Design a protein around this ligand. Structure first.
Ligand SMILES: Nc1ncnc2c1ncn2[C@@H]1O[C@H](COP(=O)(O)OP(=O)(O)O)[C@@H](O)[C@H]1O
Ligand code: BEF
Ligand SMILES: [Mg+2]
Ligand SMILES: [Zn+2]
Ligand SMILES: [Zn+2]
Lengths: 390, 15, 605, 263
DNA sequence: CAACAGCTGGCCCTCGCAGACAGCG
DNA sequence: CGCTGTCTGCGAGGGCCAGCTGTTG
């Protein structure tokens, strides 16, 4: 999540991020319910207050909310104990925010995002861009190994495909932000823009990337002014699932058919319907490719035709159950590397070694009756050294 | 009033 | 025939999209497959037309699928439809239009009906037609001339070669219309069979007969209804309409008795007229207006006994206006098909519930009896309350390690006994019977392997029925099971998978089966599919359990034999484990018991 | 979401007396405190909406239905409309010596119907929790008790809070209102520090007010007085027609004219 | 050379029929 | 000493699965 991302940042970058007022408002908005009040309280105050007082302002009931919000803001480093005054920059910058100091767009965003997904799968008709190709490949969801040949999709790439467009886009931006620092792009500049969007050379490159994903659109030959799309700030289903492992996809887009074809066999193609059968051969292939069963049920669940919505569960339980069993069937044998110790002549010392292995956290399985245990090879030397020491 | 058994009523799959 | 990248039959270059496709619920691919939507406002009208022209392939609760076959179309013209009517309505229903290939295909298989007719009179079979040209074309055919007896033109044909004549007639695109004009047949005396007013036929029952009697004449064909739908009443009603001597061919001695009782219950025919022809006894078949028998008795090939031979002589030398053939799907067997020629019948009505077979001979019913007149939708009847709602399940019983050690190694056909006699499977059956009996449910247990049936019967101390059991003894058990509260669970074998009427049997269990016999599974589930007294439409009145052994060949057969039921919308929930089993005092709780059982199974060989 | 409504009592006579007194507290600061209080509320979340209402001896008018200073653009518009609207109302006004007491029930009546008008408009998906942050700044009017009493019940029926924040005089009638409808009450004695009371006591919404420690409710004296005298009476006599609290036994109550029969 | 039909053998069970043996008069 | 019912083999058949040839790319 967005708040998750801010927490995983250094104090130096955070204070830099708390620049123009719009950022402080953006970070303020995500304060869950309580801390928003606390921010307003100690906003006009220039003198730190005791930590005990904050604790006693929340009734015993719903006390857990008092601590969790406090921990969240401590992570955000909004205030400091100073022994709980807010950051002088945040207080000042926030005070600036607090009285101080269309239909075409959505279609464009949906289409431009789709072509990226088209490229993700082996779709010959997809947008081609060297920067985009290396972006996805370096994003951890694609791999080429040969610049001349088009890249394939990694194990995580297939899972990314099934995720809903909101989470599908957000995960991509989250990966984009992390790699921005590695490639030499300042994280604060891009991160600050995203917040300001919700309402320089680095931005110009960043804006071009955002234009490529379809989140932003200048419409005026790349003018200074841009018009963000709906997805930039941050739909009815079409699949009918039958009890006999049949999917009737009411799809006109080639991408959705490509998605459904990942984990099912396509039988017939009609302009507003495609007949797909969820055969165990396909699903096992989909699971082998990297997909997780929960995603398949979720992917079919979210794109559920309205007719199935009235039924509960919308997906017939046997289909959902059967898909899971197909997943669990593959992993019947849980392979786990380890080192086995037998011929435990020292029965008394076997327990001592057992206790030592447990303390180190290396032991995986043990059998007291047979006086044997298995330890991962990583810790094999440690136990081997312990045995040699005697 | 003679409700269905647990196994038939709700899924028994671990997942 | 264009194939997409995802092995999909691309049909976008073949047909266009209709502008008002939202109202139109039908798809029609050039392959003939027709995908109808069950949630469309106009479903009811489309289904009746579609089921007639195309036999359903799968009918889930949301989107049905049908297939167009020459035999499927030939049924449409017989009932009363015409090529112009079918194609025009099909185009009206089609939301994408009918491809040129299918449009010509429908026309091709509609200019063949009525060209040639088969008429039986005075114990003689004649090939009747009003067009001499088509008759002349048939005479050119060698086998047609071979089977010949050795304006309207008719040439007599020997009875023994009726089958070959009929089979070639279809192959010559000239189906024989074996249509009986009972109302204009005074040669055969009218029987006193009459439908008592207390008997009212349900809408599907009447609709099926409407197709049979669309015109004044009576049509001969196969009428398919779900198990427990009441095919006995429809068969009785057909005899009432014909009012001629009626021959009923059940499947076993149990079938005829239930046929006898149903006639008395649903007809005014006196007990004297009703007669049976079975090895157990006979109610003077020489004098009887309605004869009830079994394929085994009539189809017996070896020399018949004097008692049976006398009846057989009378049966051959008779004229029957209506020959009801219960369990039609067994007709295409090598010998059971001969019973059609042995007996002389004008109109052959076929009643069955599972028009499926693991061979390709099920299509032979088109000419052996006639086109599939009707096929009710199981879910439609299930929601209407005419048949009890069943919560099918598949209890996954893990295989015992001692057994699986032997099963994996052994491959000389001894596996069937090994995973049929699974102690884990036995415990699930033992627990299920105990729990369901405590719920006042009438349990039925099936087992193809008699060895397994006997092993479970004595161990649980429950009655068991199979081949050797005398007709009276097995009949006694059913009566006890039907009425006696003490007998709450019964064990049955392959004998009682068909024609057993147990209306109060809420629960069913299956511990064995004969391979992937979809007919066996759908028939076996039929016993408990009968409507219950205090039945509620959406309360899952009945239940079905198919115990299987995990990681075993029975898994492959379990999926294979569920194909027919799922095609009708039944969902087979998987039960990996059963709760409450551990806290139950069930058998084979010790390795010594399981070890003893395994040795016995190996000994049986 | 929440629909806050700040029914400010901008009484020129009282606020004007402060100007003549040349005290530190002044109306301009009060509107700023309301302004900052208003900005913070919307600032909490996008879905929130607010409204501001003034009061005068004549009539009460709504004060509310790029980023030059750098603040949020939306808040910029609210400040402009409120700043200009209040000045017009204060500067322009007639003179009526007979009527000099501030009116608040009428202003509230404009507030209660606004939520209902706004409650209809809001879509069915989103449930709204409206509130009225009445900020009294002058003594109540005797003749307005009945009119004010009807609006309060309308609020209770529709579940709108009245978080009275009276100052410089404890309004016995207003403190009654906040109790009936579940609203908070607070008599701030440090007028210059008025805003900090608002951000603490009044700013948090109802769904969050419960999970918070706030000043305890003040005792409300539900006094009843006879219509003869207007003196507190513990045992009251009423008739089934007037429903009027009366001083002592009378053969017939004047307001009724009923032919009461002795017994 | 590799790959897919294809009818029959085999197995399981079931049925009708005949023969012998036991209960009854 | 005869007649009828029970039980046990002979012979055949249904349904399905699996196999060694026959045939086609
Ligand atoms: N119209 C009806 N009214 C009442 N009971 C009916 C009707 N039709 C059928 N039944 C009952 O349903 C059951 C049908 O059994 P049966 O005729 O053997 O079914 P099928 O031949 O379809 O397997 C019996 O209990 C019968 O009495
Ligand atoms: F379909 Be039934 F059981 F004769
Ligand atoms: Mg029947
Ligand atoms: Zn008085
Ligand atoms: Zn009065």
């Amino acid at each position: 999540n967005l708040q998750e991302f801010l927490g995983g940042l250094s104090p130096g970058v955070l204070d830099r991020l708390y620049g123009h007022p719009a950022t402080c408002l953006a970070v303020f908005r995500e304060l869950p319910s309580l801390a928003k009040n606390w921010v307003m309280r100690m906003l006009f105050l220039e003198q730190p207050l005791p930590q005990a007082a904050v604790a006693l302002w929340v009734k015993k009931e719903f006390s857990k909310a008092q601590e969790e919000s406090t921990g969240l803001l401590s992570g955000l480093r909004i205030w400091h104990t100073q022994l709980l005054i807010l950051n002088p920059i945040f207080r000042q910058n926030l005070r600036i925010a607090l009285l101080g100091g269309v239909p075409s767009l959505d279609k464009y965003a949906e289409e431009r995002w789709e072509v990226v997904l088209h490229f993700m799968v082996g779709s010959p008709s997809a947008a081609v861009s060297q920067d985009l190709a290396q972006l996805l490949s370096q994003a951890g969801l694609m791999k080429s190994t040969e610049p001349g040949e088009p890249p394939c999709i990694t194990s995580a790439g297939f899972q990314f495909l099934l995720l809903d467009t909101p989470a599908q886009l957000w995960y991509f931006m989250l990966q984009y932000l992390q790699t921005a620092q590695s490639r030499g792009m300042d994280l604060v500049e891009i991160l600050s823009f995203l917040f300001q969007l919700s309402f320089s050379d680095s931005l110009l490159n960043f804006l071009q990337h955002l234009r490529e994903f379809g989140l932003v659109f200048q419409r005026k030959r790349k003018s200074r002014r841009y018009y963000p799309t709906r997805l930039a700030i941050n739909q009815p289903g079409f699949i009918v699932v039958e009890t006999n492992y049949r999917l009737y996809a009411y799809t006109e887009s080639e991408l959705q058919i490509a998605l459904i074809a990942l984990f099912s066999e396509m039988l017939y193609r009609f302009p507003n319907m495609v007949v797909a059968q969820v055969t165990r051969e396909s699903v096992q292939q989909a699971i082998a490719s990297g997909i997780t069963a929960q995603q398949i049920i979720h992917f079919l669940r979210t794109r559920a035709h309205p007719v199935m919505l009235k039924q509960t569960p919308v997906l017939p339980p046997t289909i959902t159950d059967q898909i899971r069993l197909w997943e669990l069937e593959r992993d019947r044998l849980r392979f786990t590397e380890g080192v086995l110790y037998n011929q435990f002549l020292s029965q008394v010392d076997f327990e001592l070694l057992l206790a030592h292995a447990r303390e180190l956290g290396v032991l995986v399985f043990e059998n007291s009756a047979k006086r044997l245990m298995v330890v991962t090879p990583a810790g094999h030397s440690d136990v081997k050294r312990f045995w040699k020491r005697q | 009033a003679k409700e269905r058994p647990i196994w038939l009523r709700e899924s028994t799959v671990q997942g | 025939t264009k194939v997409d990248e995802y092995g999909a039959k691309d049909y976008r270059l073949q047909m266009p999209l209709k502008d008002d496709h939202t109202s139109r619920p039908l798809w029609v691919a050039p392959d003939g497959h027709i995908f109808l939507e069950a949630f469309s406002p106009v479903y009811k009208y489309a289904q009746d037309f579609l089921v007639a022209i195309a036999e359903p392939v799968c009918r889930p609760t949301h989107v049905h699928e049908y297939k167009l076959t020459a035999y499927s179309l030939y049924a449409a013209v017989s009932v009363g439809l015409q090529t112009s009517d079918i194609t025009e309505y099909l185009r009206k229903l089609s939301k994408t239009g009918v491809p040129d290939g299918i449009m010509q295909f429908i026309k091709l298989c509609t200019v063949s009906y009525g060209k040639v007719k088969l008429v039986l009179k005075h114990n003689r079979y004649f090939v009747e037609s009003c067009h001499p040209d088509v008759i002349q074309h048939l005479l050119q055919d060698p086998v047609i001339r071979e089977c010949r007896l050795r304006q309207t033109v008719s040439f007599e044909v020997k009875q023994e070669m009726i089958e070959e004549l009929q089979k070639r007639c279809i192959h010559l695109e000239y189906p024989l219309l074996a249509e009986y004009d009972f109302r204009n047949d005074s040669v055969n005396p009218d029987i006193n069979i009459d439908l008592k007013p207390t008997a009212v036929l349900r809408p599907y029952q009447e609709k099926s007969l409407r197709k049979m009697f669309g015109n004044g004449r009576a049509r001969s064909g196969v009428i398919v209804l779900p198990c427990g739908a009441g095919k006995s009443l429809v068969g009785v009603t057909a005899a009432c309409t014909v009012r001629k001597r009626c021959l009923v061919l059940g499947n076993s001695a149990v079938s005829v008795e239930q046929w006898k009782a149903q006639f008395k219950m649903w007809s005014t025919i006196d007990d004297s007229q009703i007669c049976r022809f079975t090895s157990d006894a006979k109610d003077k078949p020489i004098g009887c207006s309605v004869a009830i028998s079994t394929y085994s008795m009539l189809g017996h090939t070896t020399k018949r006994s004097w008692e049976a031979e006398r009846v057989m002589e009378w049966l051959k030398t008779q004229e029957w206006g209506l020959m009801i053939l219960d369990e039609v799907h067994t007709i295409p067997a090598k010998m059971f098909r001969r019973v059609l020629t042995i007996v002389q019948a004008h109109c052959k009505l076929g009643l069955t519930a599972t028009l499926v077979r693991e061979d390709d001979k099920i299509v032979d019913l088109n000419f052996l009896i006639g086109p599939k007149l009707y096929e009710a939708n199981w879910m439609e009847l299930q929601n209407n309350g005419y048949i009890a709602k069943v919560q099918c399940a598949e209890v996954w019983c893990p295989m015992s390690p001692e057994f699986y050690r032997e099963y994996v190694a052994i491959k000389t056909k001894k596996r069937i006994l090994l995973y049929t006699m699974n102690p884990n499977k036995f415990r699930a059956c033992q627990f299920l019977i105990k729990f369901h009996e405590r719920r006042n449910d009438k349990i039925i247990v099936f087992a193809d392997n008699v060895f397994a049936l006997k092993e479970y019967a004595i161990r649980l101390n429950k009655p068991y029925i199979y081949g050797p059991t005398s007709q009276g003894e097995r009949m006694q058990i059913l009566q006890n099971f039907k009425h006696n509260p003490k007998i709450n669970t019964i064990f049955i074998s392959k004998v009682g998978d068909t024609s057993f009427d147990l209306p109060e049997a809420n629960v069913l269990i299956q511990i064995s089966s004969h391979g992937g016999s979809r007919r066996q599974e759908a028939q076996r589930l039929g016993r408990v599919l009968r409507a219950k007294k205090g039945m509620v439409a959406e309360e899952y009145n009945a239940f079905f359990y198919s115990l299987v052994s995990q990681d075993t060949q029975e898994m492959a057969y379990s999926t294979k034999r569920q194909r027919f039921l799922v095609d009708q919308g039944y969902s087979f929930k998987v039960i990996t484990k059963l709760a409450g089993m551990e806290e139950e005092d069930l058998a084979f709780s010790t390795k010594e018991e399981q070890q003893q059982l395994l040795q016995k199974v190996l000994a049986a060989t | 979401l929440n629909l806050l409504v700040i029914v400010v009592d901008a009484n020129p006579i009282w606020w004007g007396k402060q100007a003549l007194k040349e005290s530190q507290f002044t109306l301009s600061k009060c509107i700023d405190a309301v302004m900052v209080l208003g900005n913070s509320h919307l600032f909490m979340n996008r879905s929130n909406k607010l409204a501001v209402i003034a009061s005068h001896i004549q009539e009460s008018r709504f004060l509310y239905p790029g980023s030059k200073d750098g603040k949020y653009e939306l808040l910029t518009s609210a400040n402009e409309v409120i700043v200009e609207e209040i000045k017009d109302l204060m500067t322009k006004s007639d003179i009526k010596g007979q009527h000099t007491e501030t009116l608040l029930a009428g202003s509230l009546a404009k507030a209660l119907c606004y939520i209902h008008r706004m409650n209809k408009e809001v879509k069915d998906n989103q449930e709204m929790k409206s509130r009225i942050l009445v900020i009294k700044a002058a003594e109540d009017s005797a003749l307005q008790y009945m009119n004010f009493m009807n609006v309060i019940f309308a609020a209770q029926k529709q579940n709108i809070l009245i978080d009275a924040c009276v100052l410089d005089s404890d309004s016995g009638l207003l403190q009654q209102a906040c109790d009936i409808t579940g609203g908070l009450y607070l008599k701030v004695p440090q007028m210059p520090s008025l805003l900090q009371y608002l951000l603490w006591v009044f700013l948090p919404d109802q769904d969050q007010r419960s999970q918070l420690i706030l000043p305890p409710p003040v005792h409300v004296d539900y006094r009843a007085a006879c219509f003869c005298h207007r003196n507190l009476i513990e045992i009251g006599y009423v008739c089934s027609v007037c429903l009027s609290i009366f001083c002592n036994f009378s053969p017939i109550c004047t307001t009724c004219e009923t032919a009461f029969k002795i017994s």
